[PDB]
Structure formats: structure tokens, C-alpha cells
PDB file of C-alpha atoms in Angstrom:
ATOM      1  CA  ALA A   1      92.709 124.813  71.339  1.00  0.00           C
ATOM      2  CA  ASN A   2      95.882 122.750  71.705  1.00  0.00           C
ATOM      3  CA  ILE A   3      96.043 119.903  74.220  1.00  0.00           C
ATOM      4  CA  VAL A   4      99.360 119.760  76.073  1.00  0.00           C
ATOM      5  CA  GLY A   5     100.141 117.904  79.299  1.00  0.00           C
ATOM      6  CA  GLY A   6     100.718 120.530  81.986  1.00  0.00           C
ATOM      7  CA  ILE A   7      98.082 123.021  80.852  1.00  0.00           C
ATOM      8  CA  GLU A   8      95.768 123.902  83.737  1.00  0.00           C
ATOM      9  CA  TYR A   9      92.041 123.188  83.642  1.00  0.00           C
ATOM     10  CA  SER A  10      89.084 123.476  86.013  1.00  0.00           C
ATOM     11  CA  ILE A  11      86.144 121.157  86.678  1.00  0.00           C
ATOM     12  CA  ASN A  12      82.634 122.577  87.017  1.00  0.00           C
ATOM     13  CA  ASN A  13      84.302 125.836  88.043  1.00  0.00           C
ATOM     14  CA  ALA A  14      85.195 124.110  91.311  1.00  0.00           C
ATOM     15  CA  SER A  15      88.100 121.665  91.263  1.00  0.00           C
ATOM     16  CA  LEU A  16      91.622 122.594  90.176  1.00  0.00           C
ATOM     17  CA  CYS A  17      93.604 120.142  88.051  1.00  0.00           C
ATOM     18  CA  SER A  18      96.003 119.980  85.108  1.00  0.00           C
ATOM     19  CA  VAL A  19      96.102 118.044  81.838  1.00  0.00           C
ATOM     20  CA  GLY A  20      98.021 114.778  82.159  1.00  0.00           C
ATOM     21  CA  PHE A  21      98.531 113.092  78.791  1.00  0.00           C
ATOM     22  CA  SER A  22      97.038 113.375  75.307  1.00  0.00           C
ATOM     23  CA  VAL A  23      95.305 110.117  74.394  1.00  0.00           C
ATOM     24  CA  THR A  24      92.780 108.744  71.905  1.00  0.00           C
ATOM     25  CA  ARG A  25      90.510 105.720  71.513  1.00  0.00           C
ATOM     26  CA  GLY A  26      89.467 105.020  67.925  1.00  0.00           C
ATOM     27  CA  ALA A  27      87.910 108.285  66.760  1.00  0.00           C
ATOM     28  CA  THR A  28      87.456 109.640  70.283  1.00  0.00           C
ATOM     29  CA  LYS A  29      89.954 112.208  71.557  1.00  0.00           C
ATOM     30  CA  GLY A  30      90.641 113.040  75.202  1.00  0.00           C
ATOM     31  CA  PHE A  31      93.309 113.263  77.899  1.00  0.00           C
ATOM     32  CA  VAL A  32      94.284 111.412  81.073  1.00  0.00           C
ATOM     33  CA  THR A  33      93.821 112.962  84.514  1.00  0.00           C
ATOM     34  CA  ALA A  34      93.015 112.234  88.157  1.00  0.00           C
ATOM     35  CA  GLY A  35      89.779 110.689  89.412  1.00  0.00           C
ATOM     36  CA  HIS A  36      89.029 113.145  92.215  1.00  0.00           C
ATOM     37  CA  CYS A  37      89.129 115.953  89.654  1.00  0.00           C
ATOM     38  CA  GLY A  38      85.493 115.196  88.842  1.00  0.00           C
ATOM     39  CA  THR A  39      82.958 112.480  88.035  1.00  0.00           C
ATOM     40  CA  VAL A  40      81.410 111.361  84.748  1.00  0.00           C
ATOM     41  CA  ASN A  41      79.848 114.138  82.675  1.00  0.00           C
ATOM     42  CA  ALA A  42      81.711 116.800  84.630  1.00  0.00           C
ATOM     43  CA  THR A  43      82.697 119.875  82.627  1.00  0.00           C
ATOM     44  CA  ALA A  44      86.414 120.239  81.925  1.00  0.00           C
ATOM     45  CA  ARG A  45      87.683 123.705  81.016  1.00  0.00           C
ATOM     46  CA  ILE A  46      91.225 123.735  79.638  1.00  0.00           C
ATOM     47  CA  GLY A  47      92.584 127.286  79.600  1.00  0.00           C
ATOM     48  CA  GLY A  48      89.394 128.490  81.282  1.00  0.00           C
ATOM     49  CA  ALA A  49      87.154 127.343  78.432  1.00  0.00           C
ATOM     50  CA  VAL A  50      84.895 124.334  77.901  1.00  0.00           C
ATOM     51  CA  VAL A  51      86.681 121.681  75.845  1.00  0.00           C
ATOM     52  CA  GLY A  52      84.848 118.514  76.880  1.00  0.00           C
ATOM     53  CA  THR A  53      83.587 116.398  79.774  1.00  0.00           C
ATOM     54  CA  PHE A  54      84.673 113.425  81.881  1.00  0.00           C
ATOM     55  CA  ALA A  55      84.084 110.090  80.152  1.00  0.00           C
ATOM     56  CA  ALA A  56      85.096 107.693  82.924  1.00  0.00           C
ATOM     57  CA  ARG A  57      86.915 107.523  86.259  1.00  0.00           C
ATOM     58  CA  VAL A  58      87.748 105.150  89.109  1.00  0.00           C
ATOM     59  CA  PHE A  59      87.318 105.865  92.807  1.00  0.00           C
ATOM     60  CA  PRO A  60      87.710 105.054  95.428  1.00  0.00           C
ATOM     61  CA  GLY A  61      90.419 102.409  95.115  1.00  0.00           C
ATOM     62  CA  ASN A  62      92.257 104.423  92.470  1.00  0.00           C
ATOM     63  CA  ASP A  63      92.706 108.005  91.286  1.00  0.00           C
ATOM     64  CA  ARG A  64      92.269 107.961  87.512  1.00  0.00           C
ATOM     65  CA  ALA A  65      89.985 109.507  84.896  1.00  0.00           C
ATOM     66  CA  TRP A  66      89.601 109.937  81.142  1.00  0.00           C
ATOM     67  CA  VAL A  67      88.181 113.213  79.834  1.00  0.00           C
ATOM     68  CA  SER A  68      86.462 113.184  76.443  1.00  0.00           C
ATOM     69  CA  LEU A  69      87.325 116.187  74.275  1.00  0.00           C
ATOM     70  CA  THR A  70      85.499 117.639  71.275  1.00  0.00           C
ATOM     71  CA  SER A  71      86.804 117.164  67.739  1.00  0.00           C
ATOM     72  CA  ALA A  72      87.983 120.778  67.688  1.00  0.00           C
ATOM     73  CA  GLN A  73      90.689 119.925  70.219  1.00  0.00           C
ATOM     74  CA  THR A  74      94.176 119.078  68.965  1.00  0.00           C
ATOM     75  CA  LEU A  75      96.136 116.349  70.746  1.00  0.00           C
ATOM     76  CA  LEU A  76      99.843 117.166  70.957  1.00  0.00           C
ATOM     77  CA  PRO A  77     102.526 114.789  72.223  1.00  0.00           C
ATOM     78  CA  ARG A  78     103.936 117.489  74.496  1.00  0.00           C
ATOM     79  CA  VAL A  79     104.490 118.176  78.181  1.00  0.00           C
ATOM     80  CA  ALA A  80     104.815 121.783  79.332  1.00  0.00           C
ATOM     81  CA  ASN A  81     108.355 122.693  80.377  1.00  0.00           C
ATOM     82  CA  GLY A  82     108.414 126.442  80.998  1.00  0.00           C
ATOM     83  CA  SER A  83     108.770 128.106  77.599  1.00  0.00           C
ATOM     84  CA  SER A  84     109.642 124.741  76.060  1.00  0.00           C
ATOM     85  CA  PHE A  85     107.958 121.345  75.774  1.00  0.00           C
ATOM     86  CA  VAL A  86     108.918 117.714  76.352  1.00  0.00           C
ATOM     87  CA  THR A  87     108.214 115.430  73.396  1.00  0.00           C
ATOM     88  CA  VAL A  88     106.293 112.288  74.340  1.00  0.00           C
ATOM     89  CA  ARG A  89     108.182 109.256  73.043  1.00  0.00           C
ATOM     90  CA  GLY A  90     106.725 106.408  75.097  1.00  0.00           C
ATOM     91  CA  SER A  91     105.196 105.386  78.425  1.00  0.00           C
ATOM     92  CA  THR A  92     107.777 103.096  80.022  1.00  0.00           C
ATOM     93  CA  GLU A  93     108.480 103.116  83.756  1.00  0.00           C
ATOM     94  CA  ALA A  94     111.621 104.745  85.144  1.00  0.00           C
ATOM     95  CA  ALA A  95     113.710 102.800  87.656  1.00  0.00           C
ATOM     96  CA  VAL A  96     113.694 103.762  91.334  1.00  0.00           C
ATOM     97  CA  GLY A  97     116.358 106.404  91.936  1.00  0.00           C
ATOM     98  CA  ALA A  98     115.896 107.864  88.456  1.00  0.00           C
ATOM     99  CA  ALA A  99     115.182 111.579  88.074  1.00  0.00           C
ATOM    100  CA  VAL A 100     111.705 112.473  86.826  1.00  0.00           C
ATOM    101  CA  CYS A 101     109.810 115.712  86.216  1.00  0.00           C
ATOM    102  CA  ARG A 102     106.160 116.760  86.042  1.00  0.00           C
ATOM    103  CA  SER A 103     103.961 119.710  85.093  1.00  0.00           C
ATOM    104  CA  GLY A 104     101.116 120.672  87.426  1.00  0.00           C
ATOM    105  CA  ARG A 105      99.197 123.914  87.940  1.00  0.00           C
ATOM    106  CA  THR A 106     100.172 125.962  90.988  1.00  0.00           C
ATOM    107  CA  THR A 107     103.804 124.861  91.200  1.00  0.00           C
ATOM    108  CA  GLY A 108     104.097 124.248  87.461  1.00  0.00           C
ATOM    109  CA  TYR A 109     107.206 122.336  86.412  1.00  0.00           C
ATOM    110  CA  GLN A 110     108.902 120.426  89.227  1.00  0.00           C
ATOM    111  CA  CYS A 111     111.536 117.683  89.238  1.00  0.00           C
ATOM    112  CA  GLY A 112     112.733 115.007  91.658  1.00  0.00           C
ATOM    113  CA  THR A 113     113.769 111.368  92.029  1.00  0.00           C
ATOM    114  CA  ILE A 114     111.838 108.136  92.557  1.00  0.00           C
ATOM    115  CA  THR A 115     112.083 106.595  96.024  1.00  0.00           C
ATOM    116  CA  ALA A 116     109.381 103.928  95.814  1.00  0.00           C
ATOM    117  CA  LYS A 117     106.590 102.535  93.640  1.00  0.00           C
ATOM    118  CA  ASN A 118     103.472 100.367  93.823  1.00  0.00           C
ATOM    119  CA  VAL A 119     102.249 102.293  96.864  1.00  0.00           C
ATOM    120  CA  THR A 120      98.723 102.154  98.265  1.00  0.00           C
ATOM    121  CA  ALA A 121      97.738 105.225 100.278  1.00  0.00           C
ATOM    122  CA  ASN A 122      94.581 105.935 102.273  1.00  0.00           C
ATOM    123  CA  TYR A 123      93.136 109.369 101.511  1.00  0.00           C
ATOM    124  CA  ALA A 124      90.130 111.173 102.980  1.00  0.00           C
ATOM    125  CA  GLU A 125      88.237 110.330  99.793  1.00  0.00           C
ATOM    126  CA  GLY A 126      89.307 106.682  99.842  1.00  0.00           C
ATOM    127  CA  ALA A 127      92.411 104.599  99.144  1.00  0.00           C
ATOM    128  CA  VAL A 128      94.469 104.924  95.964  1.00  0.00           C
ATOM    129  CA  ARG A 129      96.481 102.022  94.558  1.00  0.00           C
ATOM    130  CA  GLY A 130      99.485 101.986  92.239  1.00  0.00           C
ATOM    131  CA  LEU A 131     101.162 105.176  93.451  1.00  0.00           C
ATOM    132  CA  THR A 132     104.807 106.097  92.894  1.00  0.00           C
ATOM    133  CA  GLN A 133     106.755 108.065  95.498  1.00  0.00           C
ATOM    134  CA  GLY A 134     109.202 110.765  94.412  1.00  0.00           C
ATOM    135  CA  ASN A 135     111.087 113.744  95.837  1.00  0.00           C
ATOM    136  CA  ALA A 136     109.482 116.133  93.353  1.00  0.00           C
ATOM    137  CA  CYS A 137     107.646 119.035  94.983  1.00  0.00           C
ATOM    138  CA  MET A 138     103.873 118.826  95.381  1.00  0.00           C
ATOM    139  CA  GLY A 139     101.385 121.665  95.817  1.00  0.00           C
ATOM    140  CA  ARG A 140      97.614 122.145  95.793  1.00  0.00           C
ATOM    141  CA  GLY A 141      95.918 122.280  92.394  1.00  0.00           C
ATOM    142  CA  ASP A 142      98.671 120.166  90.842  1.00  0.00           C
ATOM    143  CA  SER A 143      96.299 117.202  90.625  1.00  0.00           C
ATOM    144  CA  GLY A 144      96.645 115.464  87.262  1.00  0.00           C
ATOM    145  CA  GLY A 145     100.217 116.741  87.000  1.00  0.00           C
ATOM    146  CA  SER A 146     101.875 115.173  83.965  1.00  0.00           C
ATOM    147  CA  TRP A 147     104.840 113.034  85.010  1.00  0.00           C
ATOM    148  CA  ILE A 148     107.416 112.437  82.280  1.00  0.00           C
ATOM    149  CA  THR A 149     111.101 111.570  81.937  1.00  0.00           C
ATOM    150  CA  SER A 150     113.768 113.415  79.953  1.00  0.00           C
ATOM    151  CA  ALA A 151     113.551 110.496  77.527  1.00  0.00           C
ATOM    152  CA  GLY A 152     109.922 111.448  76.916  1.00  0.00           C
ATOM    153  CA  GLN A 153     108.554 108.480  78.858  1.00  0.00           C
ATOM    154  CA  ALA A 154     105.149 109.054  80.447  1.00  0.00           C
ATOM    155  CA  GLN A 155     105.109 107.929  84.078  1.00  0.00           C
ATOM    156  CA  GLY A 156     101.653 108.801  85.403  1.00  0.00           C
ATOM    157  CA  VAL A 157      99.443 111.578  86.766  1.00  0.00           C
ATOM    158  CA  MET A 158      99.576 113.268  90.165  1.00  0.00           C
ATOM    159  CA  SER A 159      97.223 111.827  92.779  1.00  0.00           C
ATOM    160  CA  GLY A 160      97.983 113.989  95.814  1.00  0.00           C
ATOM    161  CA  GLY A 161      99.272 113.788  99.384  1.00  0.00           C
ATOM    162  CA  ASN A 162      99.497 115.535 102.755  1.00  0.00           C
ATOM    163  CA  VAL A 163      99.888 119.022 101.292  1.00  0.00           C
ATOM    164  CA  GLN A 164     100.044 121.834 103.835  1.00  0.00           C
ATOM    165  CA  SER A 165      98.271 125.195 103.957  1.00  0.00           C
ATOM    166  CA  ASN A 166     101.551 126.779 102.870  1.00  0.00           C
ATOM    167  CA  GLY A 167     100.644 125.578  99.379  1.00  0.00           C
ATOM    168  CA  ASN A 168     103.026 122.615  99.307  1.00  0.00           C
ATOM    169  CA  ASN A 169     104.603 119.843 101.368  1.00  0.00           C
ATOM    170  CA  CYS A 170     108.029 119.969  99.726  1.00  0.00           C
ATOM    171  CA  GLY A 171     109.069 122.632 102.209  1.00  0.00           C
ATOM    172  CA  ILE A 172     108.953 119.659 104.574  1.00  0.00           C
ATOM    173  CA  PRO A 173     111.905 117.263 104.674  1.00  0.00           C
ATOM    174  CA  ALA A 174     111.412 114.278 102.385  1.00  0.00           C
ATOM    175  CA  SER A 175     111.581 111.921 105.363  1.00  0.00           C
ATOM    176  CA  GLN A 176     108.251 113.346 106.515  1.00  0.00           C
ATOM    177  CA  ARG A 177     106.490 114.379 103.309  1.00  0.00           C
ATOM    178  CA  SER A 178     106.614 113.347  99.652  1.00  0.00           C
ATOM    179  CA  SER A 179     104.733 113.286  96.349  1.00  0.00           C
ATOM    180  CA  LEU A 180     102.617 110.426  95.007  1.00  0.00           C
ATOM    181  CA  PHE A 181     101.283 109.781  91.508  1.00  0.00           C
ATOM    182  CA  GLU A 182      99.483 106.906  89.798  1.00  0.00           C
ATOM    183  CA  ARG A 183     101.112 104.960  86.969  1.00  0.00           C
ATOM    184  CA  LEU A 184      99.797 105.761  83.493  1.00  0.00           C
ATOM    185  CA  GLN A 185     100.019 102.302  81.969  1.00  0.00           C
ATOM    186  CA  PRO A 186      97.221 100.851  84.094  1.00  0.00           C
ATOM    187  CA  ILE A 187      95.017 103.744  82.983  1.00  0.00           C
ATOM    188  CA  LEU A 188      95.719 103.192  79.288  1.00  0.00           C
ATOM    189  CA  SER A 189      94.802  99.525  79.700  1.00  0.00           C
ATOM    190  CA  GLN A 190      91.826 100.435  81.884  1.00  0.00           C
ATOM    191  CA  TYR A 191      89.990 102.365  79.173  1.00  0.00           C
ATOM    192  CA  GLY A 192      91.882 100.974  76.184  1.00  0.00           C
ATOM    193  CA  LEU A 193      93.548 104.270  75.303  1.00  0.00           C
ATOM    194  CA  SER A 194      96.364 105.035  72.869  1.00  0.00           C
ATOM    195  CA  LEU A 195      98.995 107.541  73.987  1.00  0.00           C
ATOM    196  CA  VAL A 196      99.739 110.284  71.463  1.00  0.00           C
ATOM    197  CA  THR A 197     103.468 110.267  70.724  1.00  0.00           C
ATOM    198  CA  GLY A 198     105.876 112.084  68.408  1.00  0.00           C
TER     199      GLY A 198
END
């Protein structure tokens, strides 16, 4: 199967997340996702089929994970954008006020602007550091959502927030609710991963 950021996957037939970024370490292939998606040796099923398992993850304190894929999986420098894809060019950080987009699961491809960064938030499952606040819509199951700029710059993966039973929190004014995601770069340095680019 092909590995593209924005393709949905499930964990142990329980948790709902989406592929963040295609990465590799030496001869090991995998992809970046959220920590609460599952623990080490949890079964990841991209497209509803077993592709590999979780290699490492950090929580609480953060919300990051690296999933180890089998050799049969192809890493593509792409982020899902409807019928099209966004070519991954780099992983630099966009300035606050800049427009950014992401690809999750339930809400799919959503866009917004950055309002703040370097945020630490206290979740029910523990605190998460290094979050970036945007006006992009957030819904449930979008965990691991692949944040990327129009310049093909990877931003990070969706952590989560106060999402309502309506399926999202973006129906709520931005002054009350927003979307948070954790910067990629830390993650790449955390596990020593190389981002697949084109």
C-alpha cells in the first residue's frame, strides 16, 4: 500500500487516527502520528489493513508517536488534498498569522490560520507540550492530522482539544474553541527520523 499523510488508520480496532508524515530511519520505514493513538507494539491499520505497529511514543507530557511499517509499504512525500495531493518540500515552521491546512479523518481536509504557538495544554490523559493554535476546524478522529503549508512545509500532527459531541468544535467561535497540534521538528529529532520529501 501507499503511505500518504491524511490517509485514515485505526489502532487495535479501537482508536481512530490519521497518517501524519512519511518518515524513515536508516532502513526502517514508518510514519509520524499522535501519542494517544496507541502505545508501543499497537497494531496500526492504514486503509483498514495491518501495515505495521507502533515503535515509540511519548506521553504524558507530549502527544507524539512513530509507527514502524513493513518493507512492503511505500513512503510518499504527499499530503491528501481531496482528489489531489500536497508535495512535501520541507518541515519549516510557518509564522503566526500564516494560513495552514491539514488532513485528518472525519473532517478530512481543513484549513485555517495560526494564532499562537509553543502552547502547553492539560488534557484528561495528561499535559501536552509544544502545541500550535490555529483556526482550522477540528473534529473527532482527526488525531494525527497532517499539518502542511501550501509551500509543502510540514508543521506537525494534530493533538486534539475540547471537541464537542456535534463532531467538532469549529462550529464554536474561535474565541472559545480552537485546534491544537504538536510541532513535527521535535518529533523528528526525538527519534532521529528523516522526513520523506519530493
